[PDB]
Amino acid sequence: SLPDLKIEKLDEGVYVHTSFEEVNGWGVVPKHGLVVLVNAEAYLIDTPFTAKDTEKLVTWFVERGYKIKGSISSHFHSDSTGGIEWLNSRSIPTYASELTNELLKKDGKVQATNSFSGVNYWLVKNKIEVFYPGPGHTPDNVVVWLPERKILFGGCFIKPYGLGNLGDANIEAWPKSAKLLKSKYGKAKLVVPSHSEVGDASLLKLTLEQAVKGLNESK
Numbered sequence: 001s002l003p004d005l006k007i008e009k010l011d012e013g014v015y016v017h018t019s020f021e022e023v024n025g026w027g028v029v030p031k032h033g034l035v036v037l038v039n040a041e042a043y044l045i046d047t048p049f050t051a052k053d054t055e056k057l058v059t060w061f062v063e064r065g066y067k068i069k070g071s072i073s074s075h076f077h078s079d080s081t082g083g084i085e086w087l088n089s090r091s092i093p094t095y096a097s098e099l100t101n102e103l104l105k106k107d108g109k110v111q112a113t114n115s116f117s118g119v120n121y122w123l124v125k126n127k128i129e130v131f132y133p134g135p136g137h138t139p140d141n142v143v144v145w146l147p148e149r150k151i152l153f154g155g156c157f158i159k160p161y162g163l164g165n166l167g168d169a170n171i172e173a174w175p176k177s178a179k180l181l182k183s184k185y186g187k188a189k190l191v192v193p194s195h196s197e198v199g200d201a202s203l204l205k206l207t208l209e210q211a212v213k214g215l216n217e218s219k
């Protein structure tokens with residue numbers, strides 16, 4: 001009996017969707033993703049945990065005149081991919097990196113129907129960019145950049161106050177990856193993490209600090 005899916009305007013044409021799980025040992029965890037509008041078309045940046053919540057989310061925007069053109073999953077964990085099966089079931093195109101789909105397959109999960117590879121990928125040319133900084137929270141994690149309003153979705157890689165679940169993490173690489181991300185995206189106006197509140201580009205420095213600290217206090 002946890003809070004319900006929330007949808008909230010972040011900037012013009014950019015919405016944050018927040019869904020909720022109770023995870024043993026952590027308590028209630030929020031999960032943020034985005035819905036990005038381009039004309040009468042909406043793009044999901046990460047899916048909620050469940051089919052149910054992905055249905056709610058899609059319907060919210062359809063009922064407002066938008067076609068759901070596709071969704072992109074920042075990494076293979078359920079908090080980014082839990083809605084792929086329902087989106088596939090609706091013939092909404094789903095995008096994940098080639099590395100994420102191979103991890104979905106190995107984890108016994110349904111994969112995204114469209115895959116991409118490389119450091120930079122345009123989901124929508126000059127409007128929605130995907131960037132791979134390196135392994136960190138997971139081997140596959142990517143971030144999503146909106147050049148318009150200078151908004152960076154960092155997924156579960158942006159971890160300003162603690163790294164979270166390290167089961168699938170690479171703590172060796174994470175400081176390397178986080179320095180790179182800070183370098184590329186220092187001029188972001190807004191940075192959206194998966195599990196804490198939106199902030200500015202200082203969240204990139206905080207993440208780098210948390211990655212260094214986790215490497216150091218790993219010995």
Ligand SMILES: Nc1nc(C(=O)O)c(CCc2ccccc2)s1
Pocket residue numbers: 021023026029031079137156159161162163164165166194195196
């Ligand atoms: N679905 C969930 N993802 C994660 C994750 O680490 O990405 C969870 C751990 C909770 C946590 C999140 C942020 C900072 C500290 C702890 S739960």
Ligand SMILES: [Zn+2]
Pocket residue numbers: 075077079137138156
């Ligand atoms: Zn994760």
Ligand SMILES: [Zn+2]
Pocket residue numbers: 077079156194195
């Ligand atoms: Zn997470």
